[PDB]
Amino acid sequence: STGSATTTPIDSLDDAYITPVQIGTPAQTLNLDFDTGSSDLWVFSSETTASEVDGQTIYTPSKSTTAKLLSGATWSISYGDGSSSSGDVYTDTVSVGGLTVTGQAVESAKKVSSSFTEDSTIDGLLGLAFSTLNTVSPTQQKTFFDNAKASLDSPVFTADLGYHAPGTYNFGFIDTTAYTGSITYTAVSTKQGFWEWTSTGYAVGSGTFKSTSIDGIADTGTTLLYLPATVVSAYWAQVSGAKSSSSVGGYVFPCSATLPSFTFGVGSARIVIPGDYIDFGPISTGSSSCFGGIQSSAGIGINIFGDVALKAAFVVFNGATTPTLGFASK
Secondary structure: OOEEEEEEEOOOOOOOEEEEEEEOOOOEEEEEEEEOOOOOEEEOEOOOOHHHOOOOOOEOHHHOOOOEEEEEEEEEEEOOOOOEEEEEEEEEEEEEOOEEEEEEEEEEEEEEOHHHHOOOOOOEEEEOOOHHHOOOEOOOOOOHHHHHHHHOOOOEEEEEOOOOOOEEEEEOOOOOOOOOOOOEEEEOEOOOOOOEEEEEEEEEOOOOOEEEEEEEEEOOOOOOEEEOHHHHHHHHOOOOOOEEEOOOOEEEEEOOOOOOOEEEEEOOEEEEEOHHHHEEEEOOOOOOEEEEOEEEOOOOOOEEEOHHHHOOOEEEEEOOOOOEEEEEOO
C-alpha cells in the first residue's frame, strides 16, 4: 500500500504545516501537524477542557463506531518549545492520504497548553519519530508509520514541504518526479528516538564550504533551523545590522536586508536554503526588525534541522531495519 497527502502552511510565514487525517467511522477529518520530532498522535477532542478549545476541530470518539477506549492508558507530553498536552487514549481507524491503519492509538487531549489553544489551525499532532518516544502509559503505543510499515510497498515516508506553498507527505514510495538530481542517503542514530544524523558542514551565501560535523535531528515539527552558536554567528555576520536580541529571544535583522543563502552538507552533497526562506518577518506588527530563521541551539541541547532546512529539500525517512535519511534538491 501507499498514501499521499498534501500538507499546507498554517500561515504566511510557514510557521507549521497541517495535513488532513481521517479518524474513525464515519471519518472525522482533523488537520494535524506531522512531527518527525515526536511520537504521539494526539488530538483535540470532545474530552478537551472546553475553555482550552478555541476554533479547533475535535475528535468525538463516541460518534465513531470503530473507537475503543484503551483501558487504563494515559499520555502526557512536553515539547521543546515548552508546550504540553495530556489525556486518555482510544484505538480507532486512521487514514492519511488513502493509507489506512486499524487499531491506531489516538491520544485524546483532556488538557492542552495555551499555545495549542491559541492556534486554531492545528487540531493535533501526528508523531513520526521512533515509537520509543511515545508517551502512552502503562503500555507504550506505536506511531502511525510504525503500524503502517509492514503493509507499505517500501518502509519509507517522504517530506516535501513547500516554501510559502503546499507540499506533500508520501508513505510507502519515493516519487522520483518530486526532486532533481539524486538522493544522498546518510546514517541515522535512533539512540535518542529521533531521526538524528550528521551534516558534513555548511556555507554562508557564496562563501567557502566549511567541513565540520554537525549532529542534529530532522524535525518537521520545528519551524526554524537551530545550529551551534559559531555557525549561526557566522551566518548573521553577513547581514548588516543583524544582532542577537536577548529581549526578543534570538537573532533579528533589519527588514530592509536581503538575506544570504545557507548551505548544509549531506555527505558530499549540498542543500541550499535560499535567503528568503530565512525571513520570518517583523517581530511585532509594523516593526522594521525581522526575526531570523536560523537561530542558536545553544540553549536546546541538540541541533534541529527544522522546516527552514527541510523545505529546501525532498527528504526521505527510510524506516528499514537500519534507518537512514535521504536528501535531494528540488
